[PDB]
Amino acid sequence: DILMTQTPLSLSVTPGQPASISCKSSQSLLDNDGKTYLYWYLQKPGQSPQLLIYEVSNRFSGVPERFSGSGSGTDFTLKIRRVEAEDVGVYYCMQRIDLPWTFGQGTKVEIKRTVAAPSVFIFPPSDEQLKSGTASVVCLLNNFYPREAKVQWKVDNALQSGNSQESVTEQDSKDSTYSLSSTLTLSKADYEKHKVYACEVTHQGLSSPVTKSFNRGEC
Amino acid sequence: DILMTQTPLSLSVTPGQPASISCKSSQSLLDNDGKTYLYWYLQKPGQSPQLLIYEVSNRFSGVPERFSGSGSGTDFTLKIRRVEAEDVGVYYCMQRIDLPWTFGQGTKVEIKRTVAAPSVFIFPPSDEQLKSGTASVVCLLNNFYPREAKVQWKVDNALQSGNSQESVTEQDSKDSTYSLSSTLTLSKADYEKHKVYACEVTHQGLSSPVTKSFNRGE
Amino acid sequence: EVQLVESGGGLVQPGRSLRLSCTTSGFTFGDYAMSWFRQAPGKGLEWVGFIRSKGFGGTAEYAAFVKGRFTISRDDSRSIAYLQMTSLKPEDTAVYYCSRVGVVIATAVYWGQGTLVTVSSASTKGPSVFPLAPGTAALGCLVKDYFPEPVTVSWNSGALTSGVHTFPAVLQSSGLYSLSSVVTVPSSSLGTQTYICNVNHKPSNTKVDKKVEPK
Amino acid sequence: EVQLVESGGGLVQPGRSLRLSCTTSGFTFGDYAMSWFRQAPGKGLEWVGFIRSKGFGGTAEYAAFVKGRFTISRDDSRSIAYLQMTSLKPEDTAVYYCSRVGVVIATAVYWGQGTLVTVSSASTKGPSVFPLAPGTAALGCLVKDYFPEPVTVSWNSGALTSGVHTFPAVLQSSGLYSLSSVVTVPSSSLGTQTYICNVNHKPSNTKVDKKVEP
């Protein structure tokens, strides 16, 4: 098989600055017809792969001019002349000079943006879920950057461990932020033994940790 | 070049009856890849060609099932199981195993209906046209089958030759008949030197010739 | 739906050049070989040439009668194929067809309506329309001495269509075309119903709407 | 106007078979080679196979890891390409994509949305949907305990897209998936505008429209 080695595997670019992604094939992709069979695909978050460049350097129809490609034989480069927020995603190179058609591992392109502190919301468990014997409490961190964030659950000010799970969206294509959910799961019994539930968020954009809390059935 | 010869060149088919058209190529149409590059086209009157059969035996999508092809090597047959009025037109075979792509000369297909005698009309030349120096005399044969007919111009009992032209419509969709014009052209001077102008029509539906006459100026 | 439209045809003097276009829609034009055909008035079909998709080198092939003089080209961004003709001869007079060549069915599958190319020394000339004055009566209009093709004829702005027979043109020994259009009508209508032939010769921008009176 | 729609995905037990369909419109289906790809959860793209136009023999080619197990065929009259899978392994779990291969641009150019095939011995479970009640206010829906992936969530039957964040599903210790979908709305709209989350879990035929109220 022909191996496609992309470097780097991930990157974080300041918007407006260029980005360059290298693809190295273990064998030449030049065919007897004089064409080189190297293609560049972009997969945006939540979308299907889309073709950016065909035969090393040709833009597919409707692809912006800031995208260009170059290379010869086994060394190829995809250049984004001015990275925009809409270009976030995973870029793949592909060869089809030989069977099997092979892709590179993909380069994830994060774009930087100014620091944004998250807006924090806490959600107590519903009444219908408490009938099932399970209590789910949710803390929402919304529209923040950078992605690093420390979310800590406190029950009657006791730091919880082991009963929470996080989920984070991929970087937004318009504003370039993330959102994060942290779900505290406790038994209906353990939930009625305590009163004050709180999530405490530490983030580069906040002067000090921000706390959001509620009291059991208290409004 | 590969020569493609169709037989027959013309076919008169009773509605609902079958038709078969042969195509012979001067070389084999079987290529080294196992495919046979013989195709069948129909051109309806006043229309672009349309494909009927590809690779000897395969029906293009939407082509009615009454069309079938068969053959191999150098001899191929198109079969129309039950000919309808829509099937009227010229059928071509075409090869593309070799350059140039070449067609047969085309096989005309018409509907064979019952004999219908033509209605005959004669038109003297126009007075406006006579002011211009030329006289045109028109004889019209209307709504007849079969298409074959003899139209003869007689001027003062003398048969005319080389100074008339005929034009015939395509077969009419409504009744499967034809219509026909024959146009006699003389100078104004020659026209005014004679009296009796007649067109005589002979046709399968007439037990005796039909003559339409006029005397110049009456 | 697959659409192909030929254009550019018309009257051309011998030795001159003329370019035909095949404007396409309804498919990725670049993926298909495009082929040109022609049909002389009253003759059979004739292959002229084709050009391959650029996926297979984008090169063209040509008939024998046609080479040196004609160049087939393609604009994949505009979805237009071209037939560039040079040093035209009277024998090149034909309706020219463009066609999309299939992949499963690797022949000319979809055809345009065609474009009439007339190679001739003669000048454009509008026709002269004369009446053919009349239980059913026949009348008509004689459309004499026009060039080139085509003319159209209707009766009463297109309202009268039954019994109309517009004959194909015949080429006269003079080089000019001529045809007649006839219609059968009930004799009870002569004298009260108005019958008008509508003759249109677009090559000369000639409109004639002649009324036919009985004698 | 080129459209390609994968279907047939879902949960399938290891060792059993499953056929995917790629239904197309907007082009002469028979003229084109059709190719299949796949993407494991959180992984890169891999080529599964393709099938040539009948005008080029209609033969298929395959990646080694599907040889002797997967078969690609096409129904030219219906404009459908098939991926017949047999002896499915847990590794085969992936979103499967079909694509139209160009002639000029002779790679996979137009792709469908993908269909998710989950090869596991676990049983299908529908999700419970619980509300996440309220300048700017935030509400949402908790879609808890379902298997397998995926679920779709809309807001006010697709009339509400701005501010929506539907998080990636997390696989709990339960062995079942859970996620939440949130939206930020003006505080002024509470009490005058109604907010419905439309959840659907096709593997279990679950359809819930849970109203979220203050």
Binding site: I97, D98, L99 | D98 | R52, F56, V101 | -
Partner: peptide, 24 residues
């Protein structure tokens, strides 16, 4: 022979790996 084919490169051996070619 090959120059009559509209859907193939008329040159012999247009691809090193023909099974990699979906359009031949």
């Amino acid at each position: 022979n090959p120059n009559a084919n509209p859907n193939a490169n008329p040159n012999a051996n247009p691809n090193a790996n023909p099974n990699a070619n979906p359009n031949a």
